[model samples]
Target: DSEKLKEEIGKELEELRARLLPHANEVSQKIGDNLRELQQRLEPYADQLRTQVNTQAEQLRRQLTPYAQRMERVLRENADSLQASLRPHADELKAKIDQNVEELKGRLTPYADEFKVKIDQTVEELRRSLAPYAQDTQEKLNHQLEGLTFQMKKNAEELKARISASAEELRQRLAPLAEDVRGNLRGNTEGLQKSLAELGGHLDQQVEEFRRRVEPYGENFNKALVQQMEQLRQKLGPH
Candidate 1:
């Protein structure tokens, strides 16, 4: 009997990975079946929180990119004498601002990650339930998305506030430089005064541009979440 059992076992490999690996298909099948069966036997759960916040999500969403290359040139050539004295010269300003922006954008990464990871969590939770609800269904998934949208909207404000403070600190650091420029040590008195005055205005322009760029950052977050969701959809191994 033992020899016969070994002979049978030897007839073929016990490989299942190639045949059964696509778990997504399995879950989809289960969900599809559940969809038809128990239509009357199972009424959807009364509570919608799974889609509201507990599952679909509280909303999810971060990236970085270069700003107008000319920001440095505008300040550097126009705001000369800044090279030796204020080091907040065009290059330095850009670097400092760039770093702050990097970090600022960097902070948003977590929100995006939080949601992506949350999506992962949500999807896993979905896997178990997909068989039962046969699926709770899409509007619930829709809420998951809206929740992330609101969550990101909430987080963007915090992000924007952070960026504003970053700008303010840069402004404060420039004060000493601004004062020196006003003194016109280079002796191009009128031009320097004019430049310094407009300098204040221009820096505001830089911040305006900075904020403008930040808008895209949130948009990317949107794209990221969409990708996450698509990946999630691909992974419905609910069985």
Candidate 2:
């Protein structure tokens, strides 16, 4: 009777193990398969992020490099052309003044003798008729010419100085603009780098999370496989 009870307990234990084994195997297989599937799904998204970073960096470089070059060229050309045009205008003004002076000198040379004779006759008549008024009129005319010459010289100096100053100012203005562009480019590059880094980090975190989430299932599958293998070995023992 005791031998029969022992036999019955062994059979029941074997049956329970057999029933549990298949269920455990199925659960383990399902968990492992799902983990693998999750890994496969995440791989494409990771690859896509890498591609996005590379593509955006290349495109931004391509777009900005030429733009920076063009901006530099425009600034240089505009400054050079403006200075060239202004220099000519300044030279022309000096030439016109010199020509006017030479022409006046030639006219006065021919009229000198006749002008002195007429002036002597008129002076004698004026001395007898209105000496005080004649002196005052001659003095006023000389003073007016002197004042006009002084004003003309001051105006020419001021205009030339203003032109030079304005050109320098314009050249300096380009510096700040170029700097601002450079800063903007740098900022954009940094922003891109930061974004890419963040994306990479996020992807890494997600991949790790997926791995973490699936780790227990993988371990469970390995444990179940080993147990089944051991059981099979025991069943075929003494070989």
Candidate 3:
């Protein structure tokens, strides 16, 4: 009976060991399967995330490409249009300015020549108007000088005839009383010489008065001419 009981206890302990080993193996296998399933699920999520990121990048490229191209085309077209619109107008304005400059130049030459011609004509007209007066003045002066000279010559001839007649009468009268009459004759001749000197002084005064009267007419003409020339200078500008 003691040997049989010892065998039965040993058998029981062996059966318990076998049962516990199978349970531990089953639990370890289940844990390993759960870990593998989690790995598979997480791997698919990484690939899906990569795919989504790639799809978003492609979508952004597609959306922005047309907008960028439109902006570039608009900028290029507007620049070309602006240049086209302004070029002709700029050339036209430049041409107009040049034409105006040429026209001004064309007008200036004729205007200057016309002004000079007018001045010359005015001066010539003035000279023509004054010529008759100048000639009249010269003729009057010549007439007065000639009249004075003829009057002086006539007075001298008359004086010479009177002295010759007086000398002949004295010689006849003093023939009987010669020595006494000689003194009287000398005194009479000296008186006649003094009278002739007084007449000469009076004639000289008349000539001087005539010259003084004529000088004012010449001076007035010269003054008027100078005044007209000054007016012309004022009308025209400096060269």
Candidate 4:
């Protein structure tokens, strides 16, 4: 009986394997059929949906195009009308500005010229007020300079005259001293000449005395010579 139970269990296992394998294939086929049916069912509405979308887009474009064009036209019309309306006012303002400038210039012209005249008058008045002082200062300076120059000239002349007088006095003072020196030189020369003459006379007197003493000895010797010659002649007798 255990063997028969084992064989029955084996047959049940084989049948389970076979049934499980076919169940997976059946599920796969069912999924494929469902996708195809869904694709077929949705295919009809795609064109309608696209048509509605296109129609709505066209309706929106048609609705907005007129407003855009009208806005552009309105902007153009308003720009032209604004320009037309403001042109006269702009021109009037420009004219007014030019007129105001001219009027201001006209109003200021007299004041500017008067200011210039007043400045010139003030300058002239100042020059007139200071003229006497300038002239008096110049004259005083010139007088002072002239006086200084005259004093300098007088001082120079006095210096020259004093120098000349001092030179003359020096010459006068030296003349007597020069004459005294010449007189002293002459007296010394005469005294020296007299002393030399006296010395020469004394020398001549001594020489004469020595000549007289030698002459006496010469006479005695001549007498002895004559006596000797006579004695010798007598002794020789004849010739």
The candidate scoring highest on lDDT is 1
Per-prediction TM-score, please? 0.33, 0.32, 0.43, 0.29
Query: Native-vs-model 1 lDDT?
Result: 0.57
Residue 63 displacement (Å), model 1: 70
Q: What lDDT is reached at residue 129 by model 4?
A: 59
State the local distance difference test value for candidate 4.
Answer: 0.52
All models: lDDT? Answer: 0.57, 0.53, 0.53, 0.52
lDDT of 4 by residue, 1-239 (tens): 99999999999988876777768787668879999999899988987899999999999999999998999999878756755664565455435544643453354334324433443454356455546757857655445434433443343344334334443443343333333333333335354345434534643454354334333433453354345435544653576
The lDDT-based order of candidates, best leading, equals 1, 3, 2, 4
Higher-ranked by TM-score: 2 or 4: 2
Preferred candidate (TM-score higher): 1 or 4:
1
**In candidate 1, how many Å is residue 221 off?**
5.2
Model 2 lDDT tens row, 76-193: 7875675565555445544544464345334433332343344345434534554454576866545543443344334334433433444344334333433333333233546434
The candidate, 1 or 2, that scores higher on lDDT is: 1
- What C-alpha lDDT, on a 0 to 100 scale, does residue 116 get in candidate 3? 40
Residue 49 in model 2: lDDT: 98
In candidate 1 the C-alpha lDDT for residue 203 amounts to 63
- What TM-score does model 1 achieve against the real structure? 0.33
Q: Model 3 residue 50 lDDT?
A: 100
